[PDB]
Amino acid sequence: SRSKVSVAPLHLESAKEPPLNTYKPKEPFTATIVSVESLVGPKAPGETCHIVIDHGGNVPYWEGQSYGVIPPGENPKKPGAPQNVRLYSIASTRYGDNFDGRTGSLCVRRAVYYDPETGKEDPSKNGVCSNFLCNSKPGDKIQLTGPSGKIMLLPEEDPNATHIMIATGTGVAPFRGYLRRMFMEDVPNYRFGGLAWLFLGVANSDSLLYDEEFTSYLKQYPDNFRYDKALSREQKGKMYVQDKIEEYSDEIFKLLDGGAHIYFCGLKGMMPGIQDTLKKVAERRGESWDQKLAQLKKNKQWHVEVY
Numbered sequence: 001s002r003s004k005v006s007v008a009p010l011h012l013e014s015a016k017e018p019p020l021n022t023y024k025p026k027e028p029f030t031a032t033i034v035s036v037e038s039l040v041g042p043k044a045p046g047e048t049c050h051i052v053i054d055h056g057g058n059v060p061y062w063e064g065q066s067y068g069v070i071p072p073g074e075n076p077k078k079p080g081a082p083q084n085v086r087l088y089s090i091a092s093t094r095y096g097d098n099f100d101g102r103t104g105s106l107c108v109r110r111a112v113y114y115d116p117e118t119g120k121e122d123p124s125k126n127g128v129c130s131n132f133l134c135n136s137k138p139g140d141k142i143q144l145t146g147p148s149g150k151i152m153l154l155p156e157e158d159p160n161a162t163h164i165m166i167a168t169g170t171g172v173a174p175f176r177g178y179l180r181r182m183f184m185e186d187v188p189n190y191r192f193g194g195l196a197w198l199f200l201g202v203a204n205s206d207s208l209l210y211d212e213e214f215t216s217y218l219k220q221y222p223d224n225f226r227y228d229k230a231l232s233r234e235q236k237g238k239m240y241v242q243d244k245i246e247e248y249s250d251e252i253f254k255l256l257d258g259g260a261h262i263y264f265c266g267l268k269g270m271m272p273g274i275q276d277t278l279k280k281v282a283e284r285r286g287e288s289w290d291q292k293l294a295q296l297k298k299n300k301q302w303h304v305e306v307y
């Protein structure tokens, strides 16, 4: 009776390459919604929902990939054509939230349109797929394609590697799946003993996603996990993720020089600030960020999936 949760079926560890494009837009797999829950409190700027989908084992994936969802309806401008696919990073491990290899989960922020001037909402301008997803109920069907993506696959060749994960908002999704695989699940062939460090930037406390889960790893694996948060409307210029990275810049640089992998996922808007900060930090140390970056890319330590 140990701390790691048993997962099945272990034959999901036997594949040598990740599944890709198993289902395509012309003939999607019809999955079923198991549950939908809001992840945020009243003060969040908008709703972010957690959706568990039963694919019954027919649409397996690896951590870090995405599922494509085709919302119902006709393409707003392709008469007789189906809506385009929207991609969502999978937020669960390959065994899924019920530890049985039958489900996958998505972390979806509702894209709501407000008139800038009148602040008035106009539902005809809301994002179609995200609202359809957070409006779903148990038993509803969803058309899935994929899985897709290789950029965010977790490098497992060294089980003692260092992984520094920087997310904003729904960009936390792939990291929830990495971390359950590193810490929560009993996966015999992947026993993590390195350092995983998660930085998460959100608007405020009520907008934190999966905080209870991440906080718990702090108490169980104090030597292998670090977690820092930045609340842009409730912290110590206000607080963005780049500021936290600045705070720990020496450690981070030291880790990157030692071979650490670094990942960024979430809204593309997060990137410019981060890159400014890293250049300024490098400069203070007397290093060229440009040269450092070229080296991290060459060594395959730099992983970005922003949208």
Ligand SMILES: Cc1cc2nc3c(=O)[nH]c(=O)nc-3n(C[C@H](O)[C@H](O)[C@H](O)COP(=O)(O)OP(=O)(O)OC[C@H]3O[C@@H](n4cnc5c(N)ncnc54)[C@H](O)[C@@H]3O)c2cc1C
Pocket: 066, 086, 087, 088, 089, 090, 107, 108, 109, 110, 111, 112, 113, 124, 125, 126, 127, 128, 129, 130, 131, 170, 171, 173, 305, 307
């Ligand atoms: C690799 C990848 C991973 C992703 N992972 C995630 C994830 O984990 N979670 C997540 O929440 N998203 C994720 N996304 C984004 C996701 O794919 C969708 O882009 C997002 O959910 C919005 O799609 P939608 O169909 O709701 O909006 P769409 O209907 O495509 O609308 C796009 C935007 O246009 C605004 N808009 C629409 N019509 C008008 C109009 N007439 N005038 C003015 N504005 C208008 C809408 O309000 C919306 O903001 C990811 C994207 C990629 C590429």
